[PDB]
Amino acid sequence: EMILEEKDASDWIYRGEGGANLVLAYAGSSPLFVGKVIRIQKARRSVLTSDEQHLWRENNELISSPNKEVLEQRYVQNVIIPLLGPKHVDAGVRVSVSKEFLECVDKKVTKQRPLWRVNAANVDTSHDSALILNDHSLFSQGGDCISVEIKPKCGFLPTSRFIGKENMLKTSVSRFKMHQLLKLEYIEISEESEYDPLDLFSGSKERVLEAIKALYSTPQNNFRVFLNGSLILGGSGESTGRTSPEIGYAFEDALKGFIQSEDGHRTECFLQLVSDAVYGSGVLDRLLEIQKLDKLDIEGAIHCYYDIINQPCPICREGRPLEAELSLHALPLDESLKIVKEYLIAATAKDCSIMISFQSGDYVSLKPTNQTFDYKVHFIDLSLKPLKRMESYYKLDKKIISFYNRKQKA
Numbered sequence: 001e002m003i004l005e006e007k008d009a010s011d012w013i014y015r016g017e018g019g020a021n022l023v024l025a026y027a028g029s030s031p032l033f034v035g036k037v038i039r040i041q042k043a044r045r046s047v048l049t050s051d052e053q054h055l056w057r058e059n060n061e062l063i064s065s066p067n068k069e070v071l072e073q074r075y076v077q078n079v080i081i082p083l084l085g086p087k088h089v090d091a092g093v094r095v096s097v098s099k100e101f102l103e104c105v106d107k108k109v110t111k112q113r114p115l116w117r118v119n120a121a122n123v124d125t126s127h128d129s130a131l132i133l134n135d136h137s138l139f140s141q142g143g144d145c146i147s148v149e150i151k152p153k154c155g156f157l158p159t160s161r162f163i164g165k166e167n168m169l170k171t172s173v174s175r176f177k178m179h180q181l182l183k184l185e186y187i188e189i190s191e192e193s194e195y196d197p198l199d200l201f202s203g204s205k206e207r208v209l210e211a212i213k214a215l216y217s218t219p220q221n222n223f224r225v226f227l228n229g230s231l232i233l234g235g236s237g238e239s240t241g242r243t244s245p246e247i248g249y250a251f252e253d254a255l256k257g258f259i260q261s262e263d264g265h266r267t268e269c270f271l272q273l274v275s276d277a278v279y280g281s282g283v284l285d286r287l288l289e290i291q292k293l294d295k296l297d298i299e300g301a302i303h304c305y306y307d308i309i310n311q312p313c314p315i316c317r318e319g320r321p322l323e324a325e326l327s328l329h330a331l332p333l334d335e336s337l338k339i340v341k342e343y344l345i346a347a348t349a350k351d352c353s354i355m356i357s358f359q360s361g362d363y364v365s366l367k368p369t370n371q372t373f374d375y376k377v378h379f380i381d382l383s384l385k386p387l388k389r390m391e392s393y394y395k396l397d398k399k400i401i402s403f404y405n406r407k408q409k410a
């Protein structure tokens, strides 16, 4: 029991954000909130639609959620944990908030937010609740703690019965790689990321290290590093441009004390440590199993979505009739519901992040520095994706592939 009022907004500072939630770390002195983060949902510019209630009917505690914050809490603990495991997942504790606290918080951090983020979304000041999670950038509560955030994205390729001849490049080239080309076009990134999510998930030592190095070279919105809660690499609530020579010098120096290596080598040693931690723990393996719940791709699943909402299928009837996916539409409701539900769970896994906390059971021995590091892994950002979003998923996919295709015509 706790109600945060307008005065409490002074005790929270900006940490980061995505497209759904704004996150703030504690900067006050209250013993009850020290070492915690606050996850506040944003409104873009009642709790579940009828069709969402039909889709999540097997989970009754889910469909009876009073607000959207409890819904997220019950989605993680009733759907995602039975799939990922409870060891590295925190569902978090609820806390009551006021309309004013939320408004003051919104205003407090505005200046530290990205310009375009301020444009698209602000905090939803109509919610009476917020999520309190453990601040993973702190090791627990030892000395210093270097923390690494990774947004791995999708690490498998569609193998589909349902991807057309004209989109067959989707079988060979990753979604992440293809998206980079579109992102660059809409000036959402400065340069094409060198990171290939197929390497990180490959379960191969040399390929994981290759992936970690690429995440250093072009962090964008996929790689962040924190010294004791303080951002020392990556973007602040957005994607960031290439690690320049200068960013490199600062990060190399920020590593002093923690990594015991001679100047100009602490970085290559640190990237060895992150690689060893990721590879050794195999925490990615079980997440790939959840991403693979998208078995038919959006070009397959889309047909099932129109069967679920009882709407005539546009894709089938507005295309060539002899190429209509009769296969999928012949499927019973229960089957149709299963595919789309598993697709939405996969989307959660495709969009989550991983935070590895390091400190001088789970441990790494760095031969080049002669040091030992304890580490903890936690999954974060395990949101429930709206069912309505299947339609925008198909449009986005159709936009990415066709733009990739016509670029290959050069």
Ligand SMILES: Nc1ncnc2c1ncn2[C@@H]1O[C@H](COP(=O)(O)OP(=O)(O)NP(=O)(O)O)[C@@H](O)[C@H]1O
Pocket (backbone or CB within 6 Å): 015, 016, 017, 018, 019, 020, 021, 022, 023, 037, 039, 133, 134, 135, 136, 137, 149, 224, 351, 352, 353, 380, 381, 382, 383
């Ligand atoms: N428990 C935590 N400990 C430390 N940092 C956190 C924690 N939770 C969130 N963050 C930071 O806050 C940022 C945004 O949190 P996140 O849960 O990804 O918001 P989101 O808007 O739901 N993301 P997305 O839906 O992918 O756009 C992350 O990139 C983290 O750096």
Ligand SMILES: O=P(O)(O)O[C@H]1[C@H](OP(=O)(O)O)[C@@H](OP(=O)(O)O)[C@@H](O)[C@@H](O)[C@@H]1OP(=O)(O)O
Pocket (backbone or CB within 6 Å): 018, 019, 020, 021, 179, 221, 347, 350, 351, 383, 385, 396
């Ligand atoms: O659609 P994509 O795969 O690009 O993923 C986007 C994701 O939507 P999805 O996870 O529901 O698809 C968004 O999540 P919401 O906050 O809107 O819930 C947000 O995280 C974007 O930054 C992601 O773009 P990215 O920068 O990672 O490419």
Ligand SMILES: [Zn+2]
Pocket (backbone or CB within 6 Å): 302, 303, 306, 313, 314, 315, 316, 317, 325, 329
């Ligand atoms: Zn169809």
